[PDB]
Amino acid sequence: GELVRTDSPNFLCSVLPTHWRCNKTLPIAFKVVAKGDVPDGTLVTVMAGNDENYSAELRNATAAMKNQVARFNDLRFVGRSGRGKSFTLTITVFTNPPQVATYHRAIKITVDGPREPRR
Amino acid sequence: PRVVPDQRSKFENEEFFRKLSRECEIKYTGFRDRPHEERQTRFQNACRDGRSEIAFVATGTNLSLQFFPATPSREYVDLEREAGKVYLKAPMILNGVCVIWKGWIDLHRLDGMGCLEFDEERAQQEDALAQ
Amino acid sequence: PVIPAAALAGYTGSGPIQLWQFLLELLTDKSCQSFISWTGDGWEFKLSDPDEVARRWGKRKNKPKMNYEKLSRGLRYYYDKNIIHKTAGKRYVYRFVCDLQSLLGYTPEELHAMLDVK
DNA sequence: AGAGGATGTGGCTTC
DNA sequence: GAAGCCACATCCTCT
């Protein structure tokens, strides 16, 4: 369903808009997909930050794996990434031990989100 | 594919791991919207449970940590190696590379230093099912 | 115009006046006591004629379609910013919860007297 | 009456 | 001037 590679060889995730409004529901639900086998019920978590914001505030950043798919119901980014800057996503699959997959320049979050020029 | 072939190479070459090897600044990302008091108690108690949330401030890379072999532990969560300080340690598979996180946090400031030192053991043995 | 309310609250002409500063300005004007007034308890006030306040707010902001329904949504946004809170159970009654005494330079008792609020 | 979610709009500042 | 941040203004759903 249009997935993308993460920085880990074992996980892919759905496509995220390049620019979005803080606290606004995403255009397409976020999903983390495991390549290799991962036990149903396994918790998946999402975090975000960068040089301007070490830890962005997030909403509903927790999901559970089911048939290789962790589907986040209404993930939202509340913290902002800064003018021209994107967030680095850290996906964590709590297996034993925990597996982490990052995703650089994942998304830019501002107060307005994308807006047409003004005049 | 839980890991990548160039496991030892990726950790010594790739810039992502490079910057996270030196003792750089780290910090507890939990409940930033709460009074400093409540954050302190939450961070220590959760530390006793063997888990926390730290990020390398400089780079903004966040990590969810679990201090366990692979409640609490011994050399995974140190609360006496220095009064007021807390040494932590937790393994994981970061971007297909077994590594171990080592660092400390000022039980009052809620920040400190940390880094990622390669994990020869887990990496090597991770080739068991990998082959 | 007992005191420069808007000015003492931060308004310096820079951009639009904010809704709470505007209410504060009406509350320090004897003319306006008929549609908005202090209740006599601390910084609590009541919009005895919400439509008129809305109307004036609209006029001041140049939003002819402004009505109480919309002005109050502006007030509800202040609950979390701890600037104004609702007085539960009392129709059209709200209360400044920011530090007006420091901003204005007067206490509630002094301002109620200066405004002759009975 | 009143709470609060969703999202667009104009003033202003910073890059 | 674009692209940030702000404080609403509009519209609504629910109790």
Side-chain angles (χ1 to χ4, degrees), chain A residues 1-118, chain B, chain C:
Chain A
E2 188 48 45
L3 308 186
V4 180
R5 288 167 40 201
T6 70
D7 294 332
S8 176
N10 204 25
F11 305 94
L12 309 177
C13 59
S14 55
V15 179
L16 286 174
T18 38
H19 188 198
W20 206 241
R21 174 170 183 171
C22 73
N23 194 223
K24 179 179 191 160
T25 291
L26 291 167
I28 59 86
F30 191 59
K31 295 178 173 59
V32 170
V33 177
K35 294 277 270 305
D37 290 331
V38 180
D40 279 5
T42 314
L43 295 182
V44 187
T45 252
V46 170
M47 283 178 287
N50 68 19
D51 62 26
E52 258 198 63
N53 186 168
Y54 72 108
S55 200
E57 193 188 326
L58 264 38
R59 284 178 58 190
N60 312 153
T62 276
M65 198 73 97
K66 186 65 198 304
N67 287 313
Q68 302 298 289
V69 183
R71 180 190 158 290
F72 291 80
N73 179 232
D74 200 20
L75 168 65
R76 310 206 198 186
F77 293 74
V78 179
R80 300 78 109 317
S81 53
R83 192 188 174 87
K85 278 147 165 192
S86 267
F87 275 140
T88 279
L89 287 193
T90 309
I91 297 158
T92 294
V93 186
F94 295 88
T95 54
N96 248 63
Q99 296 178 68
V100 192
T102 53
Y103 189 115
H104 300 277
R105 309 193 308 290
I107 179 173
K108 177 175 76 175
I109 303 290
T110 63
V111 177
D112 287 354
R115 269 177 92 174
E116 238 60 64
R118 244 193 288 168
Chain B
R2 288 164 52 88
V3 284
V4 57
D6 263 306
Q7 214 165 325
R8 165 173 282 298
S9 197
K10 191 184 179 81
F11 181 97
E12 299 175 312
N13 300 186
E14 183 158 357
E15 197 67 42
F16 176 64
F17 293 116
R18 288 269 207 188
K19 182 175 180 63
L20 303 169
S21 293
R22 58 99 90 166
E23 282 292 290
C24 33
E25 181 178 39
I26 57 93
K27 193 177 303 184
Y28 170 61
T29 69
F31 319 71
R32 290 178 56 184
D33 65 295
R34 303 296 308 176
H36 194 76
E37 174 264 331
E38 182 183 316
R39 292 191 78 221
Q40 292 178 308
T41 69
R42 280 182 182 277
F43 168 78
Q44 184 183 281
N45 295 333
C47 249
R48 292 176 188 296
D49 298 358
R51 69 197 158 70
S52 199
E53 298 169 303
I54 266 90
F56 300 101
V57 188
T59 197
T61 305
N62 287 220
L63 281 170
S64 187
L65 308 157
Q66 279 199 339
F67 325 116
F68 285 130
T71 303
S73 314
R74 45 180 158 192
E75 91 274 6
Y76 283 97
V77 52
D78 224 304
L79 249 190
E80 55 205 4
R81 175 164 152 177
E82 177 163 354
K85 215 83 97 60
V86 187
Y87 283 70
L88 303 174
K89 188 269 231 69
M92 74 195 82
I93 295 182
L94 224 194
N95 302 313
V97 172
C98 300
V99 186
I100 292 180
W101 187 92
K102 262 192 175 66
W104 52 276
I105 280 78
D106 182 313
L107 240 172
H108 285 287
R109 284 145 55 72
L110 305 186
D111 71 330
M113 245 63 57
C115 99
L116 308 177
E117 67 194 12
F118 189 89
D119 190 315
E120 252 293 7
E121 185 65 19
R122 297 303 305 179
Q124 156 64 53
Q125 78 171 73
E126 203 72 56
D127 296 80
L129 302 76
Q131 290 159 189
Chain C
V2 181
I3 61 177
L8 285 164
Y11 188 47
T12 27
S14 177
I17 185 182
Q18 291 175 44
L19 175 62
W20 67 283
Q21 299 172 323
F22 175 73
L23 293 178
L24 211 48
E25 189 173 285
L26 296 179
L27 288 163
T28 50
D29 184 313
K30 289 280 299 303
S31 299
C32 313
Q33 304 191 324
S34 46
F35 51 90
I36 188 180
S37 72
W38 300 101
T39 60
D41 166 5
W43 300 126
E44 175 179 79
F45 61 96
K46 160 162 193 152
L47 310 182
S48 60
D49 189 353
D51 304 312
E52 182 58 44
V53 187
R55 221 194 304 305
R56 308 233 180 179
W57 174 225
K59 190 171 174 184
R60 167 74 98 112
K61 265 294 230 33
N62 190 195
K63 295 278 149 67
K65 20 205 60 298
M66 180 55 65
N67 65 327
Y68 178 62
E69 183 91 39
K70 288 184 274 175
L71 179 155
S72 74
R73 174 80 191 71
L75 295 175
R76 295 195 290 281
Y77 270 120
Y78 292 141
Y79 300 177
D80 283 340
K81 288 151 69 182
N82 293 304
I83 290 183
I84 275 158
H85 281 183
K86 179 78 190 64
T87 286
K90 307 205 182 191
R91 192 208 298 183
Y92 315 133
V93 174
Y94 295 86
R95 175 194 301 278
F96 286 93
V97 292
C98 44
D99 198 335
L100 274 191
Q101 193 178 309
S102 304
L103 275 299
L104 303 185
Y106 303 93
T107 71
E109 262 224 87
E110 304 173 342
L111 203 74
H112 299 163
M114 301 158 48
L115 294 152
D116 185 29
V117 182
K118 50 262 193 167

